[PDB]
Symmetry: D2
Subunit: 493 residues, 4 copies
């Protein structure tokens, strides 16, 4: 009932949601429509850090709130780039599409997030190749079709067939195979760098999880994403328009990847968190033959096969832990007993950690053979117990800056104050001699399933002996856990 320039004013109030990390943020009605579906709401029942909650009691946060944050930040970054550079022709349609991809990027996560595709599926179905990101595309497709989203998209200026395709590309990368993307052209290349940056890992996903995980873990975040946004521009790089950082921010960019690595070190790869994920996975494996999840047209699926049917997969969340824990079926006894051990805190025992020494790298094809190697070590110590291959767990952890051996800053372009449209490169030695010399390494953790004092003492001797035999690094507590073993190795002394 109000008019301006002779035309009626229309008031479209956005939904406002209060997030502890980002504060009060506005959700466009199209995002709301996507959020309020069983497919998206599912993420409320999947813990961001999986078993981490069993080590960090503040880490009760789920994928849901993280996904909201990623959608929000994606919008924030695209908007800012567009406000500073109208010449990029960023439309509200483009903004929505990037927001949606941010929201939906984690739709394919299973129970306990990275445990599911990182540990469980590879063991439960070695023939398949599965990733949560592929799952996110399938789940996104299912969300769209089951909830009649296409008309709603059209209503807000989206072109579904193109934009749905674009969204999927933002999530999983190129869907085929020159410029490998179809949803958007080279001059909007920078749009593909926002949610999931496959080129250098600088994206808003990190920005949310740094801040969110820190808030819940009780570890403090030292990366400033708002600063980064202020010092980001889009410049021409080899015929694409790409996000570039202000040159003097290079220190802060190295620090961003240092933060990521510290979080993996302190929290995500916590030695006990990992053994809890291991044990949960063992329980799932022992339960997989007996639990039934009903999918499309009444078909029955297993935990390991629910990934093949999005209707079933929709019902596959952290709930499965409790279904197992609370079960009475005798056939689930073995699974159930593992989870009960978790509850009584009768966990597999951490033996130690070591690393390879040279340019030596442990191949994934050889992971399975490692426990046997440990059991076959011959420590010159008098022991009450003999341990077998099956008593040992050997967990190999790849720690890196997100691109294996590569320095991600070598794949970043910068701009200078005096020529803010000119992209440049900055090399490592131009920056600082105090930076890492390598960008990838492996940590090897060894655990023992025999938890008594005598078995643990024995396991330590086998472990350190194995380290010596393989020319691995001297464990940090080596002289304490295995004083009779460490002298033999003079490379260690």
């Amino acid at each position: 009932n109000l008019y301006f320039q002779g035309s009626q004013i229309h008031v479209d109030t956005m939904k406002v949601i209060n997030d502890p990390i980002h504060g009060h943020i506005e959700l466009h009605p199209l995002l709301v429509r996507i959020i309020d579906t069983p497919q998206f709401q599912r993420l409320r029942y999947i813990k961001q850090l999986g078993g981490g909650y069993y080590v960090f009691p503040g880490a009760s946060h789920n994928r849901f709130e993280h996904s909201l944050g990623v959608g929000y930040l994606a919008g924030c970054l695209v908007h800012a780039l567009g406000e500073k550079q109208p010449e990029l022709q960023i439309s509200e349609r483009d903004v929505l599409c990037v927001q949606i991809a941010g929201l939906c990027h984690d739709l394919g996560h299973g129970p306990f997030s990275h445990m599911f595709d990182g540990r469980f599926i590879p063991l439960a179905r070695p023939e398949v190749k599965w990733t949560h990101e592929q799952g996110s595309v399938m789940m996104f497709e299912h969300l769209i079709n089951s909830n009649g989203i296409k008309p709603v998209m059209e209503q807000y200026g989206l072109i579904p067939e193109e934009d749905i395709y674009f969204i999927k590309e933002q999530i999983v990368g190129p869907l085929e195979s020159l410029w490998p993307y179809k949803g958007r052209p080279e001059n909007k290349s920078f749009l593909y760098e926002i949610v999931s940056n496959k080129r250098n890992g600088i994206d808003v996903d990190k920005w949310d999880y740094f801040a969110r995980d820190c808030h819940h873990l009780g570890i403090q975040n030292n990366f400033d994403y708002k600063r980064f946004i202020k010092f980001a521009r889009v410049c021409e790089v080899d015929n694409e328009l790409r996000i570039c950082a202000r040159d003097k921010e290079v220190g802060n960019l190295y620090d961003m990847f240092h933060t990521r690595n510290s979080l993996h070190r302190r929290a995500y790869q916590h030695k006990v968190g990992n053994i809890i994920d291991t044990m949960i996975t063992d329980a799932f494996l022992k339960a997989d033959d007996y639990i039934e999840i009903t999918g499309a047209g009444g078909k029955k699926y297993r935990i390991s096969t629910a990934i093949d049917d999005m209707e079933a997969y929709t019902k596959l969340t952290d709930n499965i832990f409790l279904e197992i824990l609370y079960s009475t079926d005798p056939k689930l006894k073995d699974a159930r007993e593992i989870l009960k051990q978790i509850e009584y805190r009768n966990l597999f025992k951490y033996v130690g950690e070591t690393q390879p020494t040279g340019q030596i790298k442990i191949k994934r094809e050889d992971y399975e053979s490692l426990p046997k190697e440990v059991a076959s070590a011959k420590p010159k110590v008098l022991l009450d117990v003999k341990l077998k291959a099956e008593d040992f767990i050997v967990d190999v952890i790849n720690m890196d800056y997100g691109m294996q051996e590569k320095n991600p800053i070598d794949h970043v372009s910068f701009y200078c104050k005096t020529a803010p449209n000119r992209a440049i490169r900055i090399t490592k030695n131009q920056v600082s001699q105090l930076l890492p010399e390598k960008f990838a390494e492996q940590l090897i953790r060894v655990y023992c399933k025999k938890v008594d004092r005598k078995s643990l003492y024995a396991a330590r001797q086998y472990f350190v002996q194995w380290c010596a035999d393989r020319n691995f690094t001297k464990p940090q507590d080596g002289d304490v856990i295995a004083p009779l073993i460490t002298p033999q190795k003079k490379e260690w002394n």
Copy 2:
């Protein structure tokens, strides 16, 4: 050996091995699967926190407060045994919570089993007993200087209050009265439970905490008050104490009684009610229990957590269709529609006996408006919320004792007018929310007319949006104009 645990609220804290032994049981670990704020998570996406981490915090703060009091006043004879007992009570105070915390004993049980009288605190005693017995805790207690018979009893008293119908406690004597004020303070509500949840809930909700518990601890002493030794606050902290209860009230207002959070709890409860006949939880000796009867068997109750929401949601049993359909409406965000809020005006108070009759009153209002729809009693929900400073009509500060700088052993009282004229003049009130289960535009417009008419008829306060939602109704009431 003790353990160090990192909590986001309290930082790195130490857990005595006896506490670890109690924590690492199915009975305690259960609290990982029960959301602190229940349906609140469906309005505040940061509110994913569970009772578990809150219980750790309460146990920690209980220890902190007892230790500080003991360090400053050796004459109180606070032993490490005393410290452990208070820590255990802090840890175990919430053991009796059910699915979605206060939804369970606040909404579900009263509807599902009106004959019984159940509280989470009673549940905590039963669950604590079950925890002790099922996990062989008594020997461990003895190993660390506790005397189980006495101390178990003491712990239960700290949780639920006096265990019988003059000093009413057996676990500890009058000269350690102050130990009963730490976990759950029945006298004035100043306890460490609040201190943890203020800070924790604020951290997760994205609302800032304005109470400083560490300051309070520095300005706390134990003084003689009528043959008891009681916690007393420094006199000049009286302002900050009023602010503590103001903070509590603001958190209820903004978050815990959020109009949508409450309707989600309502809907979840409806789903539980429609599921209760069909879900089976196996308890002691294979006996079968229902959601509503699991409170009678701690073995079954151990397996009754927020999981039940998802068991219902993921079920295929045709008998669970109705329950399942309510939860699906939650997921699609097809929620009951908020109509409005009002309050009583005078000394008038709505009795709980009459809550059930209210939707009928609303449906029977006769708005002088032409409507396309007629609504019935069953289309309305009337949610009556009691908001207070923790002791009904009473000012809790009237039950606080203070000490002065010049005589720190002398307990005194401070009255309200000695403090500030800007403080509340009353300490309890009721909020009345009305919702409609018919969600279409026409029904909602009708519901608004019935509601405002009802407010007028009952001499309740004018709804804030009254002139907008019911312009034809508001003029009739000149007390409103």
Copy 3:
């Protein structure tokens, strides 16, 4: 080119080059040498923050609020020029503050020059004029679309209110009324100045902020209210608005009116008074001014900051001995002694005309106690503190307009009883603090007897520690017992 600056409160914020040009002047940079909370730093060691950083924050938030309103409502015709003008007013609002901020115009000037009538806001207009003229800002303003004559006038109006004795503003018309509510809101006190100082002062003080300004911005709109376009709050935010003023009051209570902070301000002011005849500040054309007369010359006033405390402290001039000795007492922490606090009881209000006569009243009280010491009027300090919600006796929420979800263009009013019965029943009160300049045990004991006797005689409230500090006095008053 614009600049990015990192503020701990607001993070990385952008400064338009015109704001930079204004910031980088001696007149603005001056604010780096004036503590926000004055003597507060001597009680709260984190409160080292200056007016400078606060002014940056206010300028930033002013821009934020105007921008948000404009983005949601293009029909308001908010221009970048308008944004700049509001930002400048935010930046420059505190230009007129003197040494130790509110101590200067609150305590010093009224004592040093009782004939004049001076406020920091008037000072800000004069200093703003001086800043513009001395730094050739007008051409720069023009370069960025401002119209100096009009916009300078507008800026001054935003700072000090209407510049004359019906729409009383010239800088902008009724349809941009809302622009005058942003920096300094004379109508209801809801402005961005509060928003910055809540957050900033809390950060430095070590007291937590419980107001959410970002939420407020999301629930703010501009609606027609009597031919003006005014900022309106969403109706359901009324609770949060009351809490905003509660927060203000708690900060005054805990920090800004801290009994020791105030006595430090008092003592500093005494030192300034004893120094005023002897310190020389060179102003325009070499003319000499005093601390008390520097307000008459902006060139001199530019050089009048917290530095004056240290000029006095470090001086050797025998004529400054008395001033210097007061500051040394501050350093040795030989402060005047706090005796107690009381309040008036009825509708009774202490007039400012009578403040000067109060120490004499205290000295003339006749306590029925045998004392070793007789105290005189000059041994007592009586500090009367007006505590209110910003508009004397008035409820500021009565001067707020709201909008409802179903009609977001329609401004409405909400009354107090429509909200909550737990809110204040009055919005102003007075606190009376009494101190003694005689610091020995015997004098202090005597002062307490005089004070409590005086409270009894005047029918003031019973001091909180009354029975402890003056046990022989309190029984006489049975209104107290």
Copy 4:
């Protein structure tokens, strides 16, 4: 008036102070007595970060509040060590002494903290050798004697002559010259590691300033000192009792020194902060002949000579900046004009940054010769302006982990879970290949005092040419600021 076991109870209420960093903390009356003196209160008028406030508007904090924090944390750490290990025989006297040293460690700072002893004194009086820590001893002595503290110390169980000596040793290190300390013996060696740790830099001073500076700067702290305290013990190391860290905290210790370095990088060595300190120092130098500070017995001192008289030095704070700024004396015109340039933000112009390349290190004896080298470079660029030695400032910044070239973790001892009384060493390669390979480097900043566009463009050409001539690293913006210069160097391309 209350009794227990027949004896009167005495209630000694400590003063409580609210600090934003540490919260409500208790001050022992002896600390209060020391705090409430002109010598200590002086620290309220000296900014922690000096010129930093002119770049970071939140950095208004003074040495005073930092000193309170250090005193508090010193007490916290000593108390915790003593609570866990009664066998160390830590007394309340020991606690007080460490608290006092923490409080008083910064008493010797001058105007703008590190500017004074880092920049001003070395220029104003090159013959002398002065450090703030030496100043802190002298000021501490003056504080004690002028305020009659010795009797108060005795009253609380201190033995002044021994303990005063001990306090001074904690502040400045050994006062002479085997075990080089006299205040306490080898079995309380760990007490010397608390306030100022000369062996490996792990002390409570860092812990306070990390947290405090971060709070004011608007940069977030990522070090957790409370965690460290929980994982700290005292163990026998080469006949001393020394503070040892839990072995698995080694990652977090490396991160502690990384945090320190990031703070220097982002904030303390900010290129503009440093030029402001430079300019302030220039102003002091031009004022030094004309400002008079009255010391003991009416004697007159200068800014540069006030360090010789503690009574004068007591009156030498950040106030001197404003005395200069507000002065009218024609003789102070030149000083005053520099400060006015600061206020108008007419600052010397940043030209660029480079580093040495090899194991090459720029000697301090050669710093003075550098501007001349820059001015003598011969860029093959056509310029409107010729610049001289005096137009250039060359600021050489030593960035390191606190012990020059050394890895501080090589001077840390650790303990293991299974043997918490046994000290061990952990080497760099036992930890991680992603850590720094070097622990020290130099940054070379160049500035120009001629601020016009033409002079600045010229300065850039001289600078980059100089970098090329010296085989220094290619400036990050080199191709942008000096495109005609960079091609000549093929080591750069």
